[PDB]
Every structure is written in structure tokens, then in C-alpha cells.
């Protein structure tokens, strides 16, 4: 995923007889990758459950 970022600004006093140009604003971004799959497994035998005295 991508989260763009923005924000720059400026101000000035203008000299008469000239033409305004602009103040350059440039951006950036922060990306977030996705990890692999996380697992948690277990196995239980039947005879162990049959001989046990609790669940």
C-alpha cells in the first residue's frame, strides 16, 4: 500500500512589472509491504486422549 505525503508553502514580496512564476512543491510517499503467512499448528493422537484423565 502507498500513503502519499504533501505540504510546502512560501511567501514573498512582489517586484512591480514582473510576472509571478510559482513556488515548487514536491511530494513523497511511505509504502507498507505485507509479510508471509503466520501459522500455529498441533497434532493429538487418539490413544493419548483415550488414556488421559482430563480434557
Amino acid at each position: 500500500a502507498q500513503f502519499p505525503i504533501v505540504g510546502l508553502s512560501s511567501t514573498s514580496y512582489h517586484s512591480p512589472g514582473t510576472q509571478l512564476t510559482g513556488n515548487a512543491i514536491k511530494h513523497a510517499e511511505a509504502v507498507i509491504n505485507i509479510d508471509d503467512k503466520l501459522v500455529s499448528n498441533v497434532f493429538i493422537a487418539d490413544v493419548d486422549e483415550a488414556m488421559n484423565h482430563y480434557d
Binding site: 512591480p16 512589472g17 514582473t18 510576472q19
Partner: protein, 54 residues
């Protein structure tokens, strides 16, 4: 560029001083001064007499 304003204030179009032919305005408020605290007017008794020197 492509513009040559006269600035409406320069004399003979020579040198600087584009604000030589301008005058100031009256905002419309007089500032004056503050008033001190007078606490001794009271805190003592004032009498009056019609005639006599004392």
C-alpha cells in the same frame, strides 16, 4: 517584464523616491494618557463652612 509603470510618485523620472509626493492620513482616534488611582479622596472626613478664616 513588458511593463514600465510610472509609479505615480517619481519626480522627473530620475532616481529613487517613488513615495515623495504622498501624504499621510488621520486614523480617527486620539490616544491621550492614563488616569492615576486616587485613594485618599475618601478615608478622611470632609467638612464645609460658609464664612470665617479657620
Amino acid at each position: 517584464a513588458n511593463f514600465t509603470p510610472s509609479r505615480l510618485g517619481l519626480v522627473n523620472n530620475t532616481g529613487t523616491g517613488v513615495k515623495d509626493l504622498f501624504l499621510k492620513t488621520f486614523a480617527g482616534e486620539v490616544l491621550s494618557a492614563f488616569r492615576k488611582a486616587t485613594i485618599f479622596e475618601d478615608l478622611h472626613t470632609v467638612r464645609t463652612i460658609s464664612s470665617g478664616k479657620s
